[PDB]
Design a protein around this ligand. Structure first.
Ligand SMILES: [Cl-]
Ligand SMILES: [Cl-]
Ligand SMILES: [Cl-]
Ligand SMILES: [Cl-]
Length: 236
């Protein structure tokens, strides 16, 4: 089917409301969808699929076409080798952390995503990258910030990608049995997500802005009254 897929609805906000279901979805890539997968997405009435991937990723893994669903792609970024040097100075843990540091500020992809979600007529939307975990992690976190979800609850939704990671780790060990005794928690830094990555994205926000509200105003021109309006539309 479709991997790492979930509705952001049901998350609690700091003001006591809950995000409405059926408006914001996130997933991993949408290539080689079955006709049943297409039926699911059509029955959810999704209007836009928002793709964070690079030109090369989209060329190698084109999304399946769905009648009546419009696709918008804007790149949000500018295995054996990763495993060996995983924790070294220039290794994959440090490099992925650095990617998260660079994601939330001056991002043309997230700016377009926020522009889309500012109008109810554009919803429902689905946002995805390749694994649905890093670029979609920060983009979905931004949606949740706009909606008023706490950092603790943003982190919980972010870490849900580790269920997909567990399946990806098993798939990888089938491909390369020589790594069957690498600690699974170590492979999760590559195939999954970790609190430090999202904390690095938060830290960039906090270094640049005194509050999440200031960040949303500075990066997306979302003033307080506009945030109030969106919350009244999208929360129950
Ligand atoms: Cl999954
Ligand atoms: Cl900016
Ligand atoms: Cl092997
Ligand atoms: Cl944490």
């Amino acid at each position: 089917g479709m991997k790492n897929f979930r509705d952001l609805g049901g998350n609690k906000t700091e003001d006591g409301r809950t995000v409405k279901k059926g408006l914001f979805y996130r997933s991993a890539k949408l290539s080689n969808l079955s006709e049943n997968d297409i039926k699911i997405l059509k029955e959810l009435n999704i209007k836009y699929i928002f793709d964070y991937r690079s030109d090369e990723e989209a060329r190698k893994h084109p999304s399946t076409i769905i009648s009546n669903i419009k696709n918008i792609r804007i790149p949000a970024m500018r295995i054996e080798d990763m495993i060996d040097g995983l924790f070294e100075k220039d290794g994959a843990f440090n490099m992925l952390n650095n990617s998260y540091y660079n994601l939330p500020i001056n991002n043309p992809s997230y700016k377009k995503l926020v522009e889309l979600i500012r109008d109810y007529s554009n919803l429902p939307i689905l946002n995805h990258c390749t694994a649905g975990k890093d670029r979609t992690g920060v983009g979905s976190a931004i949606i949740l910030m706009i909606l008023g979800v706490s950092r603790e609850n943003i982190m919980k939704d972010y870490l849900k990608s580790n269920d997909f990671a567990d399946k990806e780790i098993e798939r990888f060990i089938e491909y390369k049995p020589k790594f069957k005794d690498i600690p699974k928690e170590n492979l999760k830094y590559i195939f999954g997500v970790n609190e430090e990555y999202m904390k690095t994205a938060f830290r960039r926000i906090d270094e640049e802005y005194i509050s999440v509200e200031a960040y949303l105003y500075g990066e997306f021109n979302l003033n307080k009254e506009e945030i109030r309006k969106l919350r009244n539309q999208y929360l129950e």
